[PDB]
Amino acid sequence: SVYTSFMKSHRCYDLIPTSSKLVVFDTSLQVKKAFFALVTNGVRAAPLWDSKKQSFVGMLTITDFINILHRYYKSALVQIYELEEHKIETWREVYPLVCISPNASLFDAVSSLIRNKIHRLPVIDPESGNTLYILTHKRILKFLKLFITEFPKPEFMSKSLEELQIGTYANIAMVRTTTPVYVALGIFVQHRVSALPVVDEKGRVVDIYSKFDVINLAAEKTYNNLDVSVTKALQHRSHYFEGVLKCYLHETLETIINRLVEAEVHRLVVVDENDVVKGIVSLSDILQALVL
Template sequence: MVLCSWFQVKKAFFALVANGVRAAPLWESKKQSFVGMLTITDFINILTRYYKSPMVQIYELEEHKIETWRELYLQETFKPLVHISPDASIFDAVYSLIKNKIHRLPVIDPVSGNALYILTHKRILKFLVDNELWPTQTEELGVGTYNNIAYIHPDTPLITALSVFTHRRVSALPVVDHHGKVVDIYSKFDVINLAAEKTYNNLDVTVTQALRHRSQYFEGVMKCNRLETLETIVDRIVKAEVHRLVVVDEESRIIGIVSLSDILQALVLTPKNN
């Protein structure tokens, strides 16, 4: 799916929901080229930037075109479209994803300029596992984030959670009770439900209330412990089709997070002698 930059922002996000995708390339007819990606992160940025109260409509989301939002947003930070050619290696793709801290990498034909497909961390990891292009020996897990972990509580206001996404640049937030135990997880993908149900005008609700509107069946938080091997971790992520595991202790208290980015960096980018 490709979106034109003159689409209304609201309709563009509805299109993402209707097609069951998390992002789409942006085409600008004036330049006759792809100029960026529209993602759930953009939706979160709009909400956190313009939300005032449940009584005030978010005009910028209702009326702005994508190109208007991009002009306002890019005044603060210009980020050209990061893409790759179909002839590039898996190493190049992983390096580009991690270096640029992005989750989707458009593959664009250099001759025609057409967007062929979009590479993600999950697709690359599944390819590596299916083709056994990763270390077959087991090894103790040495990747992940274990300090200054971003998390929220069940009673955290939704607008606060969205702000954490923006400032910490994370794709999911473990929901931790006041005893430190992991009870749920709120991801960027869950935010798109606000567009699907048109409930984005009230962001003062708690995270627990927002999670009641999940559009898909939720099996629970996928967890692991620090003693499990990298092979076990990868197998669990691939089978569960999730983007991260929450590392917990014996009492389900949060210790850290292991993400697809962490694993790909360990498997592909980290030198073997390290």
Template sequence: MLEKLELDDDAAEPESDIYMRFMKSHKCYDIVPTSSKLVVFDTALQVKKAFFALVANGVRAAPLWDTEKQSFVGMLTITDFIIILHRYYKSPMVQIYELEEHKLETWREVYLQATFKPLVNISPDASLFDAVYTLIKNKIHRLPVIDPVTGNALYILTHKRILKFLQLFMCEMPKPAFMKQTLGELGIGTYHDIAFIHPDTPIIKALNIFVERRVSALPVVDDSGKITNSNSSTDTNLAAEKAYNNLDITVTQALKHRSQYFEGVVKCHKMETMETIVDRIVKAEVRLTLMYIQYIH
């Protein structure tokens, strides 16, 4: 949602740039919790062990530390796991060697080949505006906060975390006009060529769609076109972690591994206001919602 907000200094209305000014007046350090879990992996660690550790610690990403270079060189996310399964899975009878035997450094060499780029990160003293800009510019969902003096990784910033921090202070600020506009009026959301799956879709096919369509969630739609569930990249990772050697199982079977605390799909309507949707996203602690109009055809 944050990437859809206008970040133009020449705003027409005085209050329309209030959130931008708020972001510029707060540092990344302000958003770092006093106590939080941060998992760091050495690039010499096996790929399989790294992903199991992500699941065991309940985190979705971890900075990668290169002992030889004595610096952070990248990030490992659930998307990487999906790409590995998408690229190398053949059948339940064939072991995924690249997952079982490769080290993280080997996978990075194979996947990135000659396109190694410096890790995108941000200083704790940088403004939240800079953090939002960096997330958008680099088209990433997670931004590690690294102290330039000590080299220590402090936290991983996300759109969701920044939005939650902003929402804490919204009641104290003038409300921009766009917050009272509907999603339809603002033109926010995906309305055409929506990627989706069915309850009986094999999990490997869902993985393929995640990679080919570059989406982070897929609505699960029944034969009548009604949304019955949703499958996110996180769900796929957890399901695959429990039985990644058999990705021919259906999405319905995979989603049985979901947390008992899962409360259902978070939905919205194009006639609801931005203010309503922001509140819903923050309270539900999700990164996106499914827009329910009537049916998906």
């Protein structure tokens, strides 16, 4: 209702932080170095600049790191020659730029995120040609959170999750507690999902394995042994910060949105009476429901 007319008012400029850091890679850069650079700079993804044609060509994300690993991995006994040798330009041959103007509406942003099925959109100033900021779902929803007490509350915010039917509740991509990382990476490529809830033998969620937890293999340089379990890869944070995160089918939408912006995560695991799964409500699911 009033949420749609809201995002048609505010430009993308209102989302850009006063001061921010923007890592950019040249297409001729060795792809391995680019992945390390993401770790050293604390940046999740970086725009790509083709020096020859003098124009941004796309984005390099952790998904690319998952694609490279899964595509070329013989064993822990043989190194991944291509990951060591390939350039960003060369890998993009084996495997159009989607962007937006800062003067464009915040409604066009959410739309372009869903239509192109991408999570991160490069905000590029058409005047100077420069890249400004990387727009995400967490950034957009957290922005609307600042105005849920300014713009009147619609009727559906008080409705339960089961009534609104928001999110996916069929064929949920999950991994076992002992599922090798390579196999998990294969699931990321096939089903194209952001995270994989980790479950034990009882069928309960003990942990969750997102795409962000994959660069830790590039951080600790354990990327050459993908034979290890998904639990072994989540050991580096198993002792601190956790965590878990979930919700129920009877909880209101507003309670759920408040849960996402607070924990600053991309999704919740919709559980039943116990800890066994029942569905996944993502941030892409919520934003989609406040546009249509």
